[PDB]
A and B are shown apart, each in its own frame.
Chain A
Amino acid sequence: TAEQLAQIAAENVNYKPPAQKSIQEIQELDKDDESLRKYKEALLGRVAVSADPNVPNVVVTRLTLVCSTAPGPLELDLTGDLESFKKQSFVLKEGVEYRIKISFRVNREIVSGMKYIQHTYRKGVKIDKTDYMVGSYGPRAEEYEFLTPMEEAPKGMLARGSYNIKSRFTDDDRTDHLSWEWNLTIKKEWKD
């Protein structure tokens, strides 16, 4: 339908985030304890890093569809102009298994509880919320990969067509790292 889009749509702790804390503040607690220093080094690790408040802490680079079948690789480059995703739509073949892979850089401090929330709409009716806990990471030069658990695209006569997506990243602090909309289209086959 277009109406009963709202029935389909009807298919929808508390942890509390830590008091805020800086990496420098972290490195100074129990500075005496050699096992605890090493623990920090294993996680942070062997120092040294950037720190000028000016750069953002987290920068997300690409969101990529991993899926054996697929004939092209499918990617949103999120360094370029996010504005212009409103002007193109990606096909995803109905009924396929996929994972989503997110690359990002952490610069300066710990991201605590980074997640990716994704709202999916059709004919102005929100039909899915989804979020993947990407988790906690400390700053380093080399970027991070993160794969979501395996999922399958939907299928059937209804499921085929055009969806409107609002994605964002946030964390347990509510930092607004990134937001954008894009379009998706579900077809019998792949484009390429």
Chain B
Amino acid sequence: MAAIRKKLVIVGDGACGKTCLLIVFSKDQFPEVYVPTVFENYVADIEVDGKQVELALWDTAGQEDYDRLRPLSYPDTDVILMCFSIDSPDSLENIPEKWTPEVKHFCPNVPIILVGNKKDLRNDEHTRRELAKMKQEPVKPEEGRDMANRIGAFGYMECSAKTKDGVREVFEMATRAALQARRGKKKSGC
């Protein structure tokens, strides 16, 4: 029954789908009415490569007025899911501006996985035309892919909390990366 427990923290601008992803991972039913700002942390038993593993999951408040409060949950962290929304090129822009500096500063040698939220919106008309209202299109998978490369993530995984597509897969990658163990401090010193 009992198992290895790995700590996982999820970061990203606000409006990117952090809380929803988590809800659906526990509850299994996408919020019908009301979305909490922050989901209470909890743990998920998940079975990966036929290994019983336990995953402590922390939602966060991505708004700037918590820039000081938020890092309280970084210590202990085994892996970081860094989120952006696929329907917001503005959130993807913020990845190497705000998120990875903060994370590479607070969790030096901790692996990251780039998580593109709300796939279901990539080919949704309303979305396509609201972005076009300001000369934008939804984020391309090949754009996200090299971001992951640019920030040096473990990998790039994309999903949709609403439709469930790829959510299961997202956390198995996280587990895979938590069970990884070879990093730092690059021979220094001496």
Q: Which residues of A contact B61 (CB under 8 A)?
A: 36, 39
Provide a sorted-by-A list of 7 A–B residue pairs whose CB atoms are within 8 angstroms: A19-B67, A39-B59, A113-B105, A127-B190, A133-B106, A136-B72, A136-B75
Are A43 and B72 touching (Cβ within 8 A)? Answer: yes
- Please, what's the 1-or-0 string for A132-165, where 1 marks a CB less than 8 Å from any CB in chain B? 0111111000000010010100100001000000
Question: Known contacts being A38-B40, A135-B74, is A11 close to B106, with CB within 8 Å?
Answer: no
Whether the pair A13, B74 counts as a contact (CB closer than 8 A) is no
A136 and B187 within 8 A (CB): no
Q: Report if B166 contacts A (CB, 8 A).
A: no
A15-B102, A35-B36, A42-B40 known; A135 vs B188 contact (CB < 8 Å): no
Q: How many residues of B contact A (CB 8 A)?
A: 32
Q: List A contacts of B74 (CB < 8 A).
A: 135-136
Stretch at the interface among A25-33, A48-56, A73-81, A89-97: A25-33
B109 touches A112 (CB 8 A): no
Contacts of A38 in B (CB 8 A): 38, 40
Are B189 and A11 touching (Cβ within 8 A)? yes
The answer to the question of A181 belonging to the interface, with a C-beta cut-off of 8 Å to chain B, is: no
Contact (Cβ within 8 A) A112 B68: yes
- Hey, which chain B residues are within 8 Å of A137, CB to CB? 72, 75
Residue B108 CB within 8 A of the other chain: yes
Contact (Cβ within 8 A) A36 B37: yes
The B interface, classified by DSSP as helix, strand, loop or mixed, is loop
Instruction: Give Cα distance in the complex from A12 to B190, angstroms.
Output: 10
Majority SS of interface residues in chain A? mixed
The size class of the interface chain A forms with chain B is 35 or more
A26 to B106, CA, bound (A): 20
Q: Roughly how many angstroms separate A8 CA and B189 CA in the complex, as a whole number?
A: 10
Contacts of A84 in B (CB 8 A): none
Residues of chain B contacted by A146 (CB below 8 angstroms): 75
Task: Report B162 CB to chain A, min CB distance, Å.
Answer: 20
- For B39, B69, B106, B187, the residue with the greatest tally of chain A CB atoms inside 10 Å of its CB is B69
Chain B residue nearest in CB terms to A14: B101
Q: Please, which residues of chain A bring their CB within 8 A of the CB of B39?
A: 35
**What residues of A have a CB within 8 angstroms of the CB of B49 in the complex?**
none
* Interface 0/1 of A112-125, CB less than 8 Å to B: 11000000100000
Closest to A12 in B: B188
- Report chain B residues within 8 Å CB of A8: 190
CA distance A153 to B75 in the complex (A): 25
A72 within 8 A of B: no
Residues of chain A within 8 A (CB-CB) of B101 are 13-16
Assess whether B106 is in contact with A135, with CB atoms less than 8 Å apart: yes
Tell me, in angstroms, the Cα distance from A122 to B74 when the chains sit together: 35
Question: Closest residue to A45 on the B side, CB-wise?
Answer: B72
B149 close to A (CB within 8 Å): no
Q: Which of A127, A134, A151, A154 contacts B185 (CB 8 A)?
A: A151
